[PDB]
């Protein structure tokens, strides 16, 4: 019922054509013949005119193809050999190939296109030696009534090697993609031209990554994302062995990562330099601009050789904060620049914390907030680079309960977690900056643990908001339990002090909570050895093999004075024989421990696939 | 400094061996001939004894392959071709293959050969017409020397064209898998034989595969197992209409999926016919078993036309229980016949609820839970069946705090949280049935709400113990809330009312907390519309939309009468619409939701991927 084209190829041996054509069953029309400059078609064109009329008979010769003596020649009939087959628009359902005819690797070219583009039938035929000729028992060359008296008597074999199936994205594709050029063009016969070699490249290509997805199809589920199964052998053994932060391959490598932040607070990314001088010269009232003054750092302040506790952590970015944003120009500008920096850093998913509370003096606080989210909305509108039409970088917000050590503090909380809620009833679309949770932050001991705020959190668990609590930071085992089993946390901060207590570790591996290191906070704070040269080892290491969803922050941008590049890289330093591997599933947490939406998950998840750089 | 093998076919021309073997620039070792037993080879050994004595040739012909006739001749060429590649151990990089010699197929094959087993280099050999013969212009011919005399004039080409990678998994293999047979044995000269096509079927499986998955690359993030990738688009296609009870195709297909049980209740397994008088007949003193007398169940039982309450459901099943297990024998039988039971259902995990110290007379609590232990942990042993030397269903405990409208009931659950702590503390080996969590039902209302347990639950959550409450059976969603907020819980059973707050939905949706559902208990005590035709709909729809961990147990399996098939057939029918990869999807969201450490679930997830049937 199908038009049945059939595919041949020719050599020196004419009357090969007659013989396919030919076939118990087949009702074949549109006969192709491929072949060289040297060889003759006027007994085939005699067999079609008289015995076949409607089978509109085409021949197509390769350009400059005569005799082979090197394989470039080859090449150039293999390409135009699959731009032949492109040429037509048929499917696999009605191919017909007869790789009989033509030199040895003209065959087998035939044999591995049918197989490649799918066929309905492969197959060959033979004739044997029933004419007597001028020598005796000779084949028959010609004359077609001999043909015919041969078939029809009957000793014609057509040994048929069956069908082939073809790999599914070369069953149609398009020949506009890769066209052929006609030299000099006769009635039913061409001469054909390729430009180059880009049906080969392509194949070639398709064909090895095919072989690199079945050579990793183990160990998938493992591997954090899917397009590391089509990695080679070579570049997957590199991926095991341990960073080497020294290296600048290394470094240019972790640079171009795409990232996920959920750790940074806005009040602590321009303290020091040209940026704070950026944020001051925007403020719309210059007058009431604090003078300005630098706190001094310590020597080597990037790695210092003794810790510092927190008073002066806190401190030394008194520059930028309260008394330098309660200036609206200077808000905006401060959030300019930190997405610049996101954008900068590469980062695609950011969570950013903020007390907007601090910065109303004649103001509502919701008027703070709305100006830092309207401000983040036109800085996200503004870069719609990215496929799909997505912003480069997203941005949601969290606001901080912030708690001290002596004074009036507990009524900041209750106004900060009213408007979180109120805020985050407020905005509801998805593809915008949000209210996505609250943050419990500040000065911590005993005395203002965390089930010291259970009647404050009640609403907010109510209205049905994600918290994070800041804990274990400069305090044992009891306030991570404390803010787990009783202010229902959903992520951990600075949790350094979970490995006392096997059982805690165990359940917050199994509820899937989420735990946020800062590796150059923790360092500058709390002290810890380099290079494997009392507080004890890095435990990301532990947490890592024991099966917790990890992720590694930056903390404070400005008084830090350092990026997510190099907290990674310091993270890989303060752990030796942590591997690449590691980073990977670093950030396959932080994409699962983020407080977003499942569809936009899902989208961050493929962003982040195909987007990982080679070696 | 590789060895150089050499393969070549040869056909009815000689002299094109020793043109092979002269390659330029290749030292070859062991020179390897195929043939059709039809031409002569003493050509060959008189050329390698005379000018190469140390290159061990080898000669071998194919099982009586006179001539071409039909396609079988060909396809037994083909399996003795890829068994004399195997049975020679060489590696990909010192394979050099000569495709000429031979029909044309032969020379097809030798491609395909070397294209898929990774040759290292693939050439054919051309002569120029040099010699005087007598007739002039002829190639060639036996004689050696003017064989040599070509060689040195330049009259040899040798079109080579690229080195071949091959299939990974393929590159070895090893000859004590597909071997050959040696009919005859002569010096340097055999002739061998194949038993069956069995490389032929295992090479087209591999190609198949690869193709398949190679067409079914995107959407794998989606599906929730990787072996579905290996079905095809007719397969896939059909996986995603909506499930048909009525059919016996589904019934069957329902009936050979693995399966994972999270909610069944040991007291209520045999309760009616046969399996009770099985139980009963075991008990090691029948003259304290009490009188038989089997409760009569209402009309049309399993799909009754009205709802009863609960206390009739659980007066239902008074003929075993308390009443019949505190004797040890029954225990051990009703422990047996339930581990019988789930291996005929295809289970391949479950967790077990049981209440030992209702069972405790004269014996402990301890030694009650000890007995069970026992006899499901020889029922493990002894059913060690499947790959890996793993038992067919690996069975865990969860023990049960019941709460009641009035009486004594508190001292029993601090009873039984205390022996659960304890039991966990016990019993450590992974590979073995141990005790996983607790459980509260019973009787619920707004006086016996879950947060008035919380400092009964305080020390469960000090020692680290999964925690699963009944909630949302008879009440409304506060319950529900209480039991999250105030308990801790890691799973909820039989949350009917969740939907009535989207904020609770929400919550539950965000932190993973799984849901269990019995769709025949829910029908016989709630009562709810079958086949589309107020209690209103059957919530299934909804939270898998939703995004919650949903999955579908039996509950009691005496008492409904039903087992996993019948229940997953009936949520089928209780939400019409529900397709099959929606009861994947509740598959996987029940391994995911399980109390199992990390490596089982790896180990069940793997094995519930290369376990689903086909349609
Ligand atoms: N000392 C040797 N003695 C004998 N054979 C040798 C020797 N050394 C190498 N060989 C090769 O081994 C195959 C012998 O079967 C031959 O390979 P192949 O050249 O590919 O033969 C195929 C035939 O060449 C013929 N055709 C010659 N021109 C052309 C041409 N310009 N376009 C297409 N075909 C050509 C074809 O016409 P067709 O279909 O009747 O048969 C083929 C020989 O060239
Ligand atoms: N009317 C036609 N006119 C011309 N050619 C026709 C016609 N009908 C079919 N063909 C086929 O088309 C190819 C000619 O280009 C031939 O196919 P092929 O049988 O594969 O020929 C290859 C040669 O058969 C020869 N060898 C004859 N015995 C055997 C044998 N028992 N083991 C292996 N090879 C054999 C081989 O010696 P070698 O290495 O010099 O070249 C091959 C012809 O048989
Ligand atoms: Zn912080
Ligand atoms: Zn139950």
Redesign the interface.
């Known amino acids: 019922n199908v038009q049945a084209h059939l595919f041949v190829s020719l050599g020196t041996a004419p009357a090969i054509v007659p013989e396919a054509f030919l076939l118990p069953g087949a009702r074949f029309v549109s006969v192709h013949v491929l072949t060289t400059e040297r060889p003759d078609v006027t007994l085939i064109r005699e067999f079609f005119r008289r015995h076949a009329p409607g089978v509109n008979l085409t021949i197509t010769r390769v350009a400059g193809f005569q005799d082979?003596?090197?394989?470039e020649d080859?090449?150039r009939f293999e390409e135009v050999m699959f731009r032949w087959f492109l040429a037509s628009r048929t499917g696999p359902e009605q191919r017909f190939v007869c790789?009989?005819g033509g030199?040895?690797?003209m065959?087998?070219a035939?044999?591995?296109a049918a197989?490649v583009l799918g066929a309905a039938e492969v197959f060959?035929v033979?004739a044997d030696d029933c004419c007597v000729g001028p020598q005796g028992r000779l084949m028959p060359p010609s004359t077609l009534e001999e043909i015919l008296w041969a078939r029809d008597q009957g000793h014609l074999?057509w040994?048929?090697?069956?069908p082939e199936?073809?790999?599914?994205?070369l069953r149609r594709i398009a020949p506009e993609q890769f066209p052929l050029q006609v030299v000099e063009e006769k009635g039913d016969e061409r001469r054909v031209q390729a430009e180059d070699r880009a049906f080969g490249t392509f194949l070639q290509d398709?064909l090895?990554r095919?072989?690199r997805?079945?050579?990793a199809?183990e160990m998938?589920?493992?591997l954090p994302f899917?397009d590391l199964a089509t990695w080679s052998e070579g570049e997957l053994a590199w991926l095991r062995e341990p960073l080497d932060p020294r290296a600048p391959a290394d470094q240019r490598w972790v640079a171009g990562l795409p990232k996920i932040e959920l750790h940074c607070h806005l009040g602590g990314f321009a303290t020091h330099g040209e940026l704070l001088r950026r944020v001051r010269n925007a403020a719309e009232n210059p007058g009431k601009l604090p003078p300005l003054e630098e706190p001094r750092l310590p020597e080597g302040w990037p790695l210092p050789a003794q810790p510092i506790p927190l008073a002066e952590y806190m401190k030394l970015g008194n520059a930028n904060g309260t008394a330098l944003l309660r200036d609206p120009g200077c808000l905006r500008e401060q959030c300019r620049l930190l997405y610049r920096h996101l954008v900068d850093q590469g980062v695609c998913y950011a969570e950013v914390r903020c007390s907007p509370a601090n910065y109303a003096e004649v103001r509502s606080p919701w008027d703070v907030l709305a100006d830092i989210r309207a401000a983040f909305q036109e800085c996200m509108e503004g870069a719609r680079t990215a496929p799909g039409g997505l912003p480069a970088c997203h941005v949601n917000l969290i606001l901080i309960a912030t708690r001290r050590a002596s004074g009036d503090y507990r009524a900041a909380i209750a106004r900060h977690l009213a408007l979180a809620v109120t805020a985050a009833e407020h905005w509801r679309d998805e593809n915008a900056c949000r209210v996505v949770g609250v943050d419990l932050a500040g000065y911590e001991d005993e005395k203002t643990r965390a089930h010291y705020f259970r009647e404050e959190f009640t609403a907010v668990?109510?209205?049905?908001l994600?918290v994070t609590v800041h804990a274990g930071e400069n305090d044992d085992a009891e306030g991570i339990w404390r803010a787990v089993?009783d202010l229902?946390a959903?992520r951990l901060g600075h949790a350094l002090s979970l490995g006392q207590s096997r059982?805690?570790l165990?359940?917050v591996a199994?509820?899937?909570i989420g735990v946020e290191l800062c590796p150059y906070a923790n360092l500058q704070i709390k002290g810890f050895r380099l290079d494997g040269s009392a507080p004890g080892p890095y435990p990301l290491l532990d947490y890592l093999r024991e099966?917790v969803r990890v992720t590694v922050n930056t903390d404070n941008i400005g008084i830090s004075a350092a990026s997510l590049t190099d907290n990674l890289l310091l993270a890989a330093r303060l752990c030796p024989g942590l591997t690449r591997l590691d980073l990977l599933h670093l950030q396959r947490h932080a994409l699962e421990t983020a407080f977003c939406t499942?569809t936009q998950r899902?989208t961050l998840?493929?962003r982040i696939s195909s987007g990982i750089p080679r070696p």
């Open positions: 082979l003596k090197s394989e080859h090449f790789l009989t030199f040895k690797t065959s087998a035939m044999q591995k197989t060959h033979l074999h040994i048929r090697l069956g199936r073809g790999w599914p994205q398709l090895q095919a072989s997805i079945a050579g199809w998938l589920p493992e899917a668990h109510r209205c049905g994600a089993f229902n959903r059982e805690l165990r359940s199994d509820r899937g099966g499942a899902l998840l493929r």
